[PDB]
Amino acid sequence: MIQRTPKIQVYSRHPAENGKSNFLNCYVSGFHPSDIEVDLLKNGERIEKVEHSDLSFSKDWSFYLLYYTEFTPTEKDEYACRVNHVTLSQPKIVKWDRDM
């Protein structure tokens, strides 16, 4: 049994611009086993219409997934990624930084 804890990045598909439609991305990578819960949050509440890639893996056998949802960034709205896994004492929440 190896157990590896996920790395998480939260970012947009295109450079972010208020009122312009785009995609919000949560990339989880480096993990094992494969069972993992990923939600995208808007102002604290889960977004329903989220898609994910098919499970694949790297040369070290660790897994990766991309979760993504169509969104329009605005002034007031905050976006985050919540991830749960057997290696985490409780779900990790990672805020979307617009620069990054």
Partner: protein, 276 residues
């Protein structure tokens, strides 16, 4: 440039919860073109790229047949490996398998591979010459002897050196306006002052394909991973990739720092320097 066709398979057991999950994915270079998921509705091999969607009912029926045979082999493997290591019925376990071939610039065979892992580590692998096996422990030796007795290497090698390469060439030819192009990274540098004695320089690569890239920071042409920050290459979600690397520098000294970009789509490595 050189190319690859790779298949990836994942099987996970479900204690007290019936049949194991099974996911199969195929790639040309970094482009996914087929998938199968046991949790999905079709229970067929499905297309994931436009150019493969032009193959006939023959291709799909047979790929479905063979992907179900993988699934069944993996179903038996999870029981066998539970036996070999005498693990309880209580835990979930995972098998993974990757095989594929590489070709060079001429599309001639270059290398082939077949790797198998249990529970996240190497179990058994085909060696370079495609004639013999590397087994990680005494349980995997049992497997190696069975696979020598069945001359599995020989027919696996026939596939990797023949079939794999022959279908790679065809996929390259059919999907050429999207497999045979390299997208040069779009680059820019940001400068963000943190104080009156320090600034952050961040080097960006966007919209590139394939995913293989190198971003290095140098100071007077000398390597610099002191106080670098590098993220993992990540997918945009439209078939292209992204990556950045950041360094924090004395103010007034921006111009001592260079960001170097190596990518297949570039005729030569870029240098970037912060110009105000």
């Amino acid at each position: 440039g050189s190319h690859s066709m790779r298949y990836f398979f994942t099987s996970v057991s479900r204690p007290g919860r019936g049949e194991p999950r099974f996911i199969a994915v195929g790639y040309v270079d970094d482009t996914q073109f087929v998938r199968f998921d046991s949790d999905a509705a079709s229970q067929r091999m499905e297309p994931r790229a436009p150019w493969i969607e032009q193959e006939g009912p023959e291709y799909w029926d047979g790929e479905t047949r063979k992907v179900k045979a993988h699934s069944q082999t993996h179903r038996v493997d999870l029981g066998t490996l539970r036996g070999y290591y005498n693990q309880s019925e209580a835990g979930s376990h995972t098998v993974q398998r990757m095989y594929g071939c590489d070709v060079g610039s001429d599309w001639r065979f270059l290398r082939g591979y077949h790797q198998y892992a249990y529970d996240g580590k190497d179990y058994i692998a085909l060696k370079e010459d495609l004639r013999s096996w590397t087994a990680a422990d005494m349980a995997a030796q049992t497997t190696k002897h069975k696979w020598e007795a069945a001359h599995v290497a020989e027919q696996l090698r026939a596939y990797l050196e023949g079939t794999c390469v022959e279908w790679l060439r065809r996929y390259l030819e059919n999907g050429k306006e999207t497999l045979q192009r390299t997208d040069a990274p779009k680059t820019h540098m940001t400068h963000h002052a943190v104080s009156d004695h320090e600034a952050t320089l961040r080097c960006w690569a966007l919209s590139f394909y394939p995913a293989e890239i190198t971003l290095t920071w140098q100071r007077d042409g000398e390597d610099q991973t002191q106080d670098t920050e590098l993220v993992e290459t990540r997918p945009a979600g439209d078939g292209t990739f992204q990556k950045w690397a950041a360094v924090v520098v004395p103010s007034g000294q921006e111009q001592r720092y260079t960001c170097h970009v190596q990518h297949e789509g570039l005729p030569k490595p870029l240098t970037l320097r912060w110009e105000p």
